[PDB]
Amino acid sequence: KNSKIFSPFRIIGNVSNGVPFATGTLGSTFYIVTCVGKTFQIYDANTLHLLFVSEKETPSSIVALSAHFHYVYAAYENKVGIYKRGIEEHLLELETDANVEHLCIFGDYLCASTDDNSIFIYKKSDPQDKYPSEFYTKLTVTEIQGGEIVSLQHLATYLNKLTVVTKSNVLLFNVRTGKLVFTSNEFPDQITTAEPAPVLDIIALGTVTGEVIMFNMRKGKRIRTIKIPQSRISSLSFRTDGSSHLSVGTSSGDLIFYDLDRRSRIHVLKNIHRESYGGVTQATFLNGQPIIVTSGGDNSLKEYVFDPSLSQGSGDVVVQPPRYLRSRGGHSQPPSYIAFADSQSHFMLSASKDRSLWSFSLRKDAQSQEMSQRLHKKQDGGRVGGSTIKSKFPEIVALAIENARIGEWENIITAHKDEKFARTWDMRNKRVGRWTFDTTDDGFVKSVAMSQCGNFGFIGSSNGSITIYNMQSGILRKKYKLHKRAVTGISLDGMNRKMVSCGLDGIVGFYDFNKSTLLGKLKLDAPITAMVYHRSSDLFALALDDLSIVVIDAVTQRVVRQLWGHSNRITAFDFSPEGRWIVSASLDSTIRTWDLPTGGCIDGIIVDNVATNVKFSPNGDLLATTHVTGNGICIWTNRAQFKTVSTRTIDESEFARMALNDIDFNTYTSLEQIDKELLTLSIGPRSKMNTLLHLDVIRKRSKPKEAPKKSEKLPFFLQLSGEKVREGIAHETPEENKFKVTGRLGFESHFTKQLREGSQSKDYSSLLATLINFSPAAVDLEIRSLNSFEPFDEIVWFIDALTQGLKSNKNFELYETFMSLLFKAHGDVIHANNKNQDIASALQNWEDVHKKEDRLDDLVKFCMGVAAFVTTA
């Protein structure tokens, strides 16, 4: 279930899953905590900007959320987690298998209610501790005491009392002592909601049959009763802005406002949230404000505001109805199609079964917007035909987008379910376009494609005809009729020359779009279900009916690769931006990555929910997938973008049970030397030879034009007096007798020891190794420092060392350079004593080797003479 190429990143498009959100205050500001499956998100109330997300996904879905100042408490299964800034600070694990249901935090006491009517109390270890950690006691409410716990509430000014609210009645427990202080009188109707009022000793209780009760805990008696026949209360909240208003949310999706002082209804907001998804799951007035934040199970979070009254007097009577202020949202049902809007990974286009098309932003959630379905006035002037009652367009089966002409005219085509035309949209304006493309053969639209130039739109019908429209004018231009069954794919190359098509009849058509000719026809074994075309490489893959992906080269019209291993239908697949990988999702709940160069499955995943769509970012950094459950889009990060991935084939039998290294990593390191007889340069920068030969002139250029000014009183040994690193030749220490000019034993350089050692051992391999490593300044210094006085042992040895190096034919350019520096520094010495046998013999042996390396000159001269002639004449 763990991929070696991809890892989860986050979920886009989700605002709230229906669990009641939690409001916390930091100073004057407010923030809202919403639940998103196995994670929560924190929004800024003033802007509804995403601030934090939980660092990791919880093992089980979150059931409750409570936020107090910086700390957030999230309850899942039998554990309660404490988070700060989205990072878990401490996890409270209850000792019973019962799952937590409700969560209450007052003072240092944390109260958690399990589904077996057991209330666990935790307490702060220290009075100044930030959050409660220590387990204090356990209180259990029995059936004789009361019904199932509906919610845990704490009323203000109550010392160590927890107000347990059950379906039958309300109970007052003392957490410090663990004793039942008080039991309320039984209520006829099942209590569903409870909310502490801003008044003392009063808690608002909402029943299952549209009754709201202002129960007074101190007096133990009813104070008021609001009646809402044929409605079920889901939320309650009081206004704290000095106006005695009460907001009642219902499961039908309506939010009613009452004026408690006047005993009147201010207004009702109808269908703010869908009934089918739970109506108004949570509605809370912001403390001390006219703003109310509402949420529901339809993946939406809204805010409404009460404007000041328009009357100069009697403002309490003339109450402005609440006004929509701002909101955030997403799809209410799982997306059906997704696509990347731009070359960068900024925006994505998503379509869902809820008949809405959304533009989602990866970079910032606030930029996400819904594409408008308002229609443009017809150019002809006739009235457009449609029902007066406005409805959303049907579900989108296919989508095609280009950006060559964004802002000039329509740049999106969409296909709808059971609809005989395709609609166009405009990404810049974020609105449906003014053109509609019809199949013209009485068939449904099954395929949509666009040319890279953005001038043409191709529509494939279920009756086998391909119509081609112009996006600027929406005028049909060409119609191709080759397929007899549905056309499930259309593509056109980057050059707008060769067009390809596939259909359920199993044939692949190759056309010449410029000349409108049939280049060829290829028949495959099984019906073709989908196509993806790679414009850079001119390869396209076809998802066949026999559970295969067939890769075809459009230039030569032959199958190049065929991929096997999926055990069920292939829902979707895509090409990697570099054209080297194909990731495909199938109905057997596996996402497989295939390596086209070797044609094998290199990676495999097992998803809990079948992935309907797969899409690479054109950058290649991200992979987006949508699943059969969940309203969001799963974003994965491509680990291949930061390290190499082995292309070894994945184990098939192992993968089923869950349900040469250079070649494997797609790299090759050049050999040090292909053959001993072949001349090979040094493994390093090619400027080293030129620097060594011309060291002085390069350095005279380096010197500043004017002498730096310096203090007269300067330490003579400042360079040595360094608090401690420098690895220069100057900073060398001797390693452990008669005086010797070259060096007395125990006080000689490392280089001189190796030279003397090599002369005795008749092998200078150790010395040649250190010469190549020496820096250009060090090399010049050592050659210049060689002993230049009779019997000239060191000069003879150095010549012998270089002569041995030339025999190796490796690093020869440097050995030539060292010899040139030897003549530069000690040429006069060699010239004066040329007759000396020792120097002459060493020189002669060097010449015998050096005479052999003239073949390089013959090769160099030939290539220029021919290369100059070939290119010229």
Residues 409-438 that bind other proteins (CB under 8 A): none
To the nearest whole angstrom, how small is the minimum distance from the Cβ of residue 550 to other proteins?
A: 11
Closest approach of other proteins to the CB of residue 508, in Å: 16
**Between 354 and 426, whose beta carbon lies closer to other proteins?**
426
Distance CA(430)–CA(372), nearest Å, equals 6
Among the candidate windows 242-250, 279-287, 380-388, 854-862, which touches other proteins by CB under 8 A? 854-862
* Segment interacting with other proteins, rule: CB under 8 A, options 292-300, 442-450, 623-631, 846-854: 846-854
Binders in 436-475 for other proteins, by CB under 8 A: 452-453
Site residues for other proteins, window 642-701 (CB under 8 A)? 642-643, 660, 662-663, 666-668, 670-675, 677-683, 685-687, 689-690, 693, 696, 699
Judged by CB under 8 A, the stretch of 2-10, 320-328, 381-389, 394-402 that binds other proteins is 2-10
Which among 94-102, 143-151, 292-300, 856-864 is the span making contact with other proteins, rule CB under 8 A?
856-864
Identify residue 250 by its one-letter amino acid code: T
Q: What is the DSSP secondary-structure string of 802-816?
A: HHHHHHHTBSHHHHH
Quote the least distance from Cβ 761 to other proteins, whole Å. Answer: 24
Q: Which is nearer to other proteins, 701 or 762 (CB)?
A: 701
Which residue, 475 or 707, is less far from other proteins as judged by CB?
707
515 lies in the binding site for other proteins (CB under 8 A): no
Q: CA–CA distance from 872 to each of 103, 341, 657, 865, 869 (Å)?
A: 87, 50, 67, 11, 5
Closest Cα to residue 603, out of 572, 634, 645?
A: 645
Binding of residue 769 to other proteins (CB under 8 A)? no
Contact track, other proteins, 16-55, x by CB under 8 A: ------------x-----------------------xx-x
| Residue that has been written with the tokens 């809990």 in this structure | 608
Alpha carbon dihedral 174, 178, 181, 182, in 10-degree steps, equals 100
Please tell me whether the peptide bond between 791 and the residue prior to it is cis, using omega within 30 degrees of 0: yes
Instruction: Identify which of residues 310 and 870 has a Cβ nearer to other proteins in the complex.
Output: 870
Question: Which CB, 416 or 561, lies closer to other proteins?
Answer: 561
Q: In the complex with other proteins, which residue's Cβ is closer, 177 or 719?
A: 719
- Per CB under 8 A, the list member of 537, 557, 609, 766 interacting with other proteins is 537
Cβ distance 602 to 649 under 8 Å? yes
Distance from C-alpha of 578 to C-alpha of 27, rounded to nearest angstrom? 50
For other proteins, which residue of 159, 310, 389, 859 counts as binding (CB under 8 A)? 859
Instruction: For 39-99, list the strands marked E by DSSP.
Output: 39-44, 50-53, 62-68, 71-76, 79-84, 87-93
Q: How far is the CB of 540 from other proteins (least distance, A)?
A: 13
Binding map of other proteins across residues 334-373, x = CB under 8 A, - = no contact? ----------------------------------------
The answer to whether 128 contacts other proteins (rule: CB under 8 A) is no
Closest to other proteins by CB, 97 vs 651, is 651
Q: Judged by CB under 8 A, which of 68, 224, 478, 639 binds other proteins?
A: 639
Residues in 545-604 that interact with other proteins by CB under 8 A: 553, 555-556, 558-562, 578-580, 596-599
- Count interface residues toward other proteins (CB under 8 A): 150
Cα(34)–Cα(18) distance, integer angstroms: 9
Q: Name the segment binding other proteins (CB under 8 A); options: 184-192, 228-236, 401-409, 563-571.
A: 401-409
Do the Cβ atoms of 537 and 553 come closer than 8 Å?
no
- Segment lying near other proteins (by CB under 8 A), choices 218-226, 294-302, 413-421, 718-726: 718-726
The residue among 201 and 816 lying less far from other proteins, judged by its C-beta, is: 816
Under the criterion CB under 8 A, does residue 713 sit at the interface with other proteins? Answer: yes
- Of 762 and 831, which CB lies nearer to other proteins in the complex structure? 831
Q: Which is nearer to other proteins, 93 or 847 (CB)?
A: 847
Restricting to residues 787-816, which ones interact with other proteins according to CB under 8 A? 788-789, 813, 816
Query: What phi and psi values does residue 639 have, to the nearest 5 degrees?
Result: -70, -15
Which residue, 380 or 662, is less far from other proteins as judged by CB? 662
Binding residue (CB under 8 A) for other proteins from 374, 390, 710, 762: 710
Q: End-to-end CA distance of the chain, in Å?
A: 64
Query: Any contact of residue 71 with other proteins (CB under 8 A)?
Result: no
In the sheet that holds 487-492, the strands lie side by side as: 487-492, 498-503, 507-512, 517-523
Q: How far is CA 267 from CA 217, 246, 590, 845, in A?
A: 29, 11, 52, 110
Residue with smaller CB distance to other proteins, 440 or 682: 682
* Residue among 383 and 686 whose Cβ is closer to other proteins: 686
Q: Are 211 and 191 in contact (CB under 8 A)?
A: no
Distance of closest approach, residue 857 Cβ to other proteins, in angstroms = 5
The Cα–Cα gap between 39 and 308 comes to: 38
Helix H or strand E segment including 828:
helix 812-832
CA separation, residue 235 to residues 73, 133, 265, 294, 682 (Å): 20, 30, 17, 10, 79
Give least dist CB 288 to other proteins, A: 16
User: CA-CA distance, 114 to 99, in Å (whole number)?
Assistant: 5
Residue among 307, 757, 847, 848 that touches other proteins (CB under 8 A): 847
Q: How far from 835 is each of 217, 788, 849, CA to CA, in Å? A: 122, 15, 20
d(CA 197, CA 203): 5
Ramachandran sector of residue 430 (left: φ over 0; alpha: ψ -120 to 50; beta: rest):
left
Using CB under 8 A as the binding rule, the residues of this chain from 732 to 761 that contact other proteins are 732-734, 738-739, 741, 743-744, 747, 749
Q: Does 833 bind other proteins (CB under 8 A)?
A: yes
Q: Does residue 85 interact with other proteins by CB under 8 A? A: yes
What span, in angstroms and rounded, lies between the C-alpha atoms of 625 and 613?
Answer: 5
CB of 716 to other proteins, least distance (A): 7
Q: Which of 33, 524, 645, 830 binds other proteins (CB under 8 A)?
A: 830
Could you say which residues in the range 178-237 bind other proteins, by CB under 8 A? none
Instruction: Name the residue with tokens 């296909």.
Output: 415
d(CA 231, CA 278): 13
DSSP states of 290-333: SEEEEEETTTEEEEEE-PPPS-SS-TTTSPPPPEEEEEEE--SS
- Residue 144 within binding range of other proteins, rule CB under 8 A: no
Between 93 and 735, CB nearer to other proteins: 735
In a 10 Å sphere around its CB, with 0-12 CB exposed, 13-18 middle and 19+ buried, how is residue 225 labelled? exposed
* CA nearest neighbour of 304 among 285, 318, 288, 319: 285
* Closer by beta carbon to other proteins, 195 or else 780: 780
Question: In Å, how far from its chain's centre is CA 635?
Answer: 5
In the complex, the smallest distance separating the C-beta of residue 406 from other proteins, rounded to whole angstroms, is 10
Q: What three-state secondary structure class fits 224?
A: strand
Pair of tokens at residue 5 = 């190429």
Residue 59 burial (CB count, 10 A): 9
Question: Using omega within 30 degrees of 0 as the cis cutoff, is the peptide bond preceding 597 cis?
Answer: no
Task: Give the chain's length.
Answer: 873
Of 59, 188, 229, 708, the one binding other proteins by CB under 8 A: 708
Interface region with other proteins, contact rule CB under 8 A, candidates 91-99, 161-169, 288-296, 769-777: 769-777
CB of 52: closest distance to other proteins in angstroms? 7
Strand partners, 324: 304
* CB of residue 390 to other proteins, shortest distance in Å: 30
- Interatomic CA distance for residues 526 and 531, integer angstroms: 14
